[PDB]
Structure formats: C-alpha cells, structure tokens
Symmetry: D8
Subunit: 62 residues, 16 copies
C-alpha cells in the first residue's frame, strides 16, 4: 500500500493528524496508529495516543 | 493488533478517552472497554464505565 | 463478551446511560437494555425504558 | 427477544418514544411499532402512528 | 408485515409524513409511498408526491 | 404605518406567519399580534396565539 | 398593551410556551410570566416555572 | 435614500426577496414591504405578504 | 415498482424535486432522473439536469 | 417585580435552572442567582454555583 | 470614509459581494448598495439588486 | 445507463456541478468526472478537476 | 452585588468555570476573573488565566 | 490606538484576515480595511477587497 | 481508470484538494494520495501529506 | 483594571488565546492585543497578530 510504504517511512517523525493533535508516530497498522509525546498548542497532552484510521481525515509530516 | 498490544500495556494506567472523562483502563476487548474510577474535571462521575469502540475517537494514556 | 460479563455484574444496580437519564439496570441482551424506575435531574420519568445498544454512547455504574 | 417479551407486556399501555410524541401501544414487530391515540404536549396528533424501530432512540412505559 | 397490514388499511385516508407535508395516501410498496392532494399549511402543493421509505421518520393517520 | 394600514385590512382573514402556523388575525399593535383559531398542517393548535413582531419574518394574507 | 390585555384574560387558562413546556398561567408582568402545574408530554415537571419574555417566541392558549 | 429612490422605481414590478419567494412590489416604507401575488418554485403562496426590512438580505428586480 | 409505474405516468409533466428546482421529467431509470427546462423561482437554470435517486428526498408532480 | 416576589418565596427550596443542573436557591439579586448543593443526574457537582440572569432561560421550582 | 472613496472608484466596475452573486456596482450610499446585471455562476439572476451594508461581509472589485 | 447515455451526450459542453463550480465536461466514467477549464462566480479556478460521482448532488447542462 | 460578595467569599478556593476548565480563583473585578493554577480533565493548562464576565455561563465552587 | 499604530506599520505588508483570504493591506480607517492583490490558496481572487472591522476576528501579518 | 489515467498526468504538478490545502502531487493509489510541499493560504504546512480518497470531494490541477 | 494590571505582568511571556493560536504578548490596550511570533500546533503562523478583546474568550499565561 502507498499507505503502508509511507507510514513506514514517517515512523520516527513528528506528525499532525486530523480526526473528524500532534506528536511522534511510534507505530501503526491497517486499523490504528499510535503516537508518542503528544502535544497541543498549550502544552503536552499524553505519553501516548491511539487513533483509528476510520476517523482520520489526513496525516501530515512535519 | 497494535490495539490489543497497547491496551494490554495500558491496562491499569489512567487513560483519557474521546467519544463524540478519564479513568483507569480496567479491562477491554474487541467491542468495548471498561474504565474504573471515572472522573471528570469537576469530580467523580461513577464507579465504572463501559464504552463501545465503534464510537471512540481516540484513547490516550496519560 | 466483556459486555455480557459486566452487564451480568451490573444487573440490579443503578446506572447512567447516554443515548445520542439514569435508572436501575433491570435487564438486557445483545440488542437492548431494560431500565426500571427512571429518573431525570428534575424527577421521575417512567416505570420502565427500552434502549438499543446501537445508539448508546456509554453506560456507567454509580 | 427481550425486546419482543417486553413489548408484549407494554401493549395496551400509554408509552413515550424518542424518534430522531406519546400514545398507547397498539402493536409492533421487528420493523415497526404502531401507536394509537397519539398525543402531543399541545394536544392530539391523530388516530394512529407508525414508527420504524431503526430511528427509535428509546421507548418508555409510563 | 405490520407495515404492509397498516398501510393497506390507511390507504384512502389523509396522512402526515416526516421525511428527515400532508395528503391522502394513494398507494405504497416496500420502497415508496405515493400521496394525492398534497397540502402544506399555506395551501395546496401538488397533484401527487413520491417519497421513499428510507428517508421517512414516521407516518401518521388523520 | 404601511404595517398598521395593511394589518387593519387583513383583520378577520386567515393569515400565515413565519416566526424564527396559520390562523385568523384577531388583533395587533406595535409589540404583538394575536391569532385566533390557530392551525397546524397536522390539525388544530389551540384557541389563540400571541406573537411578538420582533421574531416575525413575514406575515401573509391567504 | 394588546399583550397586557390578553395575558390578563389568559390568566387562569392552560397555555403552551416556546422559549427559543406547558402549564397554567399563574401570573405575569412586563419582564416575566409564571406558570403553575407544569407538564411535559411524559409527565409533570414542576410546581412552578419562571420564564422571561425576552426569550419567548410565542404563547398559545389551550 | 438610495433605498427609497430605487424602491419608488421598482413599485409595480416583480421582485425576488431573500429573508433570513418572489412577487410584485405592491408597496413599501421605512419599516416594511408589501408584496402582491406571491409565488414559490412550486406555485402560488398568497394574495399578499408583509416583510420587515430588518430581516431582508437582498431584494432583486427581475 | 410503484416508482417505475408512476414516473412513467409523470414523464413529460412538470415536476418539482427535493435533494438535500423544478422542470419537466424528461426521462429516468433506477440510478438517476433527467429534467428538462429546469427553472428556479428567479428564472431558468439550465437546459437539462441529471439527479441521482439515492439523494432524492421526494419528487412531486405539479 | 413578580420575579423578586417569586424568588423570595422560592428561596430555600430546591429549584432546577436552564442556561444555554439543580440545587437549592440559596440567594439572588438582579444580576445573578446563587445555588447551594448543586447536583446533576449522576451526582453532586459542587458546593455552590453563581449564575447570571441574562443567560437564564427558565427557572423552575420543583 | 475610505469606504466612500473606494466605492466611488469602483462605481461602474464589476464587483463580487458576500452577504451571509456578482454584478456592476451601479450605485450606493450609507445604508445600501445597488448592483446591475447581477449574474451567478449558472447565469443571470436579475436586472438589479439592492443590498444592505449591515449584512455585507466583504465587497470585492474583480 | 441513462447516466452513461446522457453523459456521452454532454461531453464537450459546459456544465454546472454541485458537490456536497462550472466547466466543460472533458470526460467521465463509472466512478468520476473530469472537468476542463473551471470557473467560479469570481473567475478561473483550474486547468482541470476530478470529481467522484458519489459526492455529486446534480449535474446540469447549460 | 451578590456577585462581589460571593466572589470575595470564594477567593482562595478552587472553582469550575464554563465559558461559552477549573482552577483557583486568584482574583477578580467587574469585568474579569483571574484564575491561578489551571487544570483540565487531562492535566495542567496554565500558570494563569484571564476571563471576562460577559462570556461566562456559570462559576461553581468545589 | 494600538490598532491605528499597528495598522499604519502593517500598511504595505501582506496580511491574512479572518472575517467570521489574504493580500496586501493598501489602507484602512476606524470602520474598514482595504486589500490589494487578494489571493486564496487556489489563485488570485480580486484586484481589491473591502472588509469592515465589525466582522473581523483577527488580522495577521506575514 | 479515468482516475488512474488522469492522476498519472497530474503527478509532479501543483494541485488543490477539498477534503471534508494545496501542494505537489507526489503519488497515489486506490486508497490514498500523497502530497509534497503542502501549503496553506497563510504559509507552509509541512513536508508531506497523506490523504485517503474516501474523504476527498475534488482534486484540481492548477 | 485587573485586566490592565495583569496584562502588564504577562507582557513578554508566551500566552494562549481563545478567539471565537499562541505566541508572545507584544502589547495591548482596551480595544486590542498584539501577539508576536504567533504559532500554531502545526507550525508558525506569521510575524504578528492583532486581536480585538471583544471576540476573546480567555487569555492564558503559559
């Protein structure tokens, strides 16, 4: 998948995501992605974060 | 599933969840997750909470 | 099902439900839940209530 | 079917419905329910009313 | 079907319909209903009207 | 006042109103209008009705 | 005021109100109205109720 | 007023109005406009219509 | 299909349609319908118009 | 003010309020009201609560 | 007023406008502006158009 | 398909499309349509445009 | 002001505020309130916070 | 005014604006600002543009 | 696939997308498209961007 | 002015704003505030930013 290909490459890099938040992309598979070091514009938000691809509009590398 | 793997690791830890609240990820499976000691900002909300995964935006380990 | 198991456990007890109200979880199954003695922030609402699992956000035990 | 079982016992009695109205439950099956002598807060609403269960949030025995 | 049964009986009678209008129910099948003499509160609207059951919330006999 | 002048002549006659309902125009002044024998598409709506002109979009002689 | 005139006359009578509920109109002045015996379609709601004229769309006598 | 002048000019003529319909600009003033013989994409709507200038978006001459 | 039957009869006649405009039902099939001489209230809108049935609320013969 | 008069009488009694919660009307004046022992359906929400009148839809004595 | 100055210069030229359409800025004053040869994307919409400034987001010289 | 047939017919010609713009129907198939030389009420928008049939309301020929 | 008096009383203490967050009411006046050590259901949010009384729904003391 | 001061300085520079678009700020006064060379992400939009300060959320220098 | 065929030829060129952003089309397949050097009206938006075709309204060659 | 007093002390420090964005507080007065080196979650947003206090919900020292 172009999606597998790219997400492999993006693994390690800070990314922004639209669900309907930013942080480093720790891992992913066909149903979810997982983020480390998650921040909002005001501060840190959580060690990790799970998000399903179903509810994801776009992902963007920083 | 990265989902299974991660939730296993998160089991016991305080987590926040988005549907459309925070507590301890007591337990889970494919269809639902179960929170313990669910609080809101104002205070406690209730001894436990079931939540369907189909309506979960994102879960986040604090 | 974590859902069957926990619901078995909560039968008898007061619970809050968000659909899209609180009362005693009288009974349930794969499709619906039956509440008994239903209250609202203003007062009584009904001897009973049927609710489909499909349109429930979360059920919470008090 | 908890739903069937429960709907049997409510037949004859005044009930309330959230769809997306109150009146006596004439009949029901899998697809729809039929309400007799439907009423609004403001007054009557007409001899009968069909309602498909798909768009029903909850029903409630008064 | 309770729905077939009733709509047969309601055929001939003025009815109101919620799609997401009133007039006499001329005919129906599993996918549509057809109305004659359609009025709004301000006046007549159209000799006939087709409406699919998919987009119909409730039907009500007058 | 075109508004006064015109409302005089419509007094007695069935009218329609958009507020944010149809029935006979009993009376009016600067602040409100009074409608008699108010009607809905679905049926009657009650002996009378006050309506403040501020929230009225248009009125219409039928 | 046509509004004073009518509300005097309507005093005693059950009325419906649109704010943005029904019951008997116990009293009113230029800023508020007060209702006794307030009901919704499901049941009683409260001995009394205050409502400011600012947020009232229409009032209707039953 | 460019508004008075142009309205004087358009009296007699068909016009469309957006509030928040089309018909002949029968008359007008500082507060309202009176339309005569009012039509909708489906047909007639009313012998006449009153509309306040406050809630009109644009008036257009055809 | 009552739908097929009726649309056949309506073919040639001016019709109004709701999606989310009026003209002559030129032709149709299962997936779409085709309008000719499509006008709006303000005027003509265009020589023809295709419209998918899946997004049609109601069609109405004028 | 009927408002002053009534709120005086209601002072001490449990009341529900709409802004956009229930408790004891502890005290009030022109600009605000103060609730004591404010609960929601799920439980207690907080020792006290101020609320501006400008944003109050309706208050209701239970 | 920069507004007066600019609109003077724009008088005669094709302009687009946002309220909540494009044509020639025929004329204007404090309360309103007047467009000539108002077209939309699909075609012509009407000989002229008045528009109140209070409801204008932005005007733009093409 | 009435859709294939009519689209074959409209290839070459200017058309308006509502999604959820106007230009020449350059080409199309079962899934998408390709527009060439795309215009908006304010001006040009693009050398070309791809659009999925799924999210089109109506296509109209000018 | 019931508002001044009660705010004097609550200075020092944790409070929840709804605007359109919780923290210590550090200080206040006729126009605004200053919060210190601000928390959200997920965690810290800021050393401090300013908020205008105009856009506050309710302030509540915990 | 801090607002006069800054807008003087920003005159000449490309800016973005939120009304409820970007280009160079040609001039301004207490009621409006005027933009030259206005672009959207897709292309140019208009030689100039007027926008009233009333409907402007923020302005931002680039 | 008109979609495939057309996307090939646009590869390398700056494009615009409506999702629910502009930049060079790096690659694509059935499930997603990849945009390089993504840009906002206000400025850059980050090295790359994945977008799933499901939530794409239209794409547009500039 | 608590507002003035407090804004003085925050000048120089990174702050967050809800309007209807974060960056260093350059200056302020009654009508507006000026933010320097404005930032988004996704990245920079431009040298400076004016914001009128009217549409500001809260400001927050980080």
């Amino acid at each position: 998948s172009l999606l597998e290909k790219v997400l492999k490459e993006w693994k390690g890099h800070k990314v922004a995501v639209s669900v309907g938040f930013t942080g480093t992309l720790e891992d992913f598979d066909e149903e979810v992605i997982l983020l480390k070091d998650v921040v909002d514009v005001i501060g840190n938000r959580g060690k990790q974060m799970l998000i399903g691809l179903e509810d994801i509009n776009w992902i963007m590398l920083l």
